[PDB]
Amino acid sequence: IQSLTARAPVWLAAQDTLNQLCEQSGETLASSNDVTEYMQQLLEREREAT
Amino acid sequence: LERDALAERYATLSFDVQKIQRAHQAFSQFVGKHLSVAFDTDPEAEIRE
Numbered sequence A: 001i002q003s004l005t006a007r008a009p010v011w012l013a014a015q016d017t018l019n020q021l022c023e024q025s026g027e028t029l030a031s032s033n034d035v036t037e038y039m040q041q042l043l044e045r046e047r048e049a050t
Numbered sequence B: 001l002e003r004d005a006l007a008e009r010y011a012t013l014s015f016d017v018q019k020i021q022r023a024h025q026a027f028s029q030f031v032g033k034h035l036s037v038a039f040d041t042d043p044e045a046e047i048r049e
Helices: A002-024 A032-049 B002-037 B043-048
Strands: none
Touching: A032 B002
16 A cells, blocks of 8 residues: 555656646547657657758 | 769768668657667566566
């Protein structure tokens, strides 16, 4: 329970900032590999823009 | 004779640009498929311990 509790606020902060970062992005995120996929898409778009 | 040199030099420069572009593509592919566990601590060591 203590381990789960020490991990509880960390998890909650992760979820909070995850939702915020998801909303800052047009596409909605659902999984870790999905997050990295979106990240590489972002790098691609950045290269084209520059 | 003059234009031959320009063709050669242009060939080399275009090759270089393509190399750079593909290098960026490789890094992007990498981060797309890789960051979830990048640069983490070695498990062989800890399992041995």
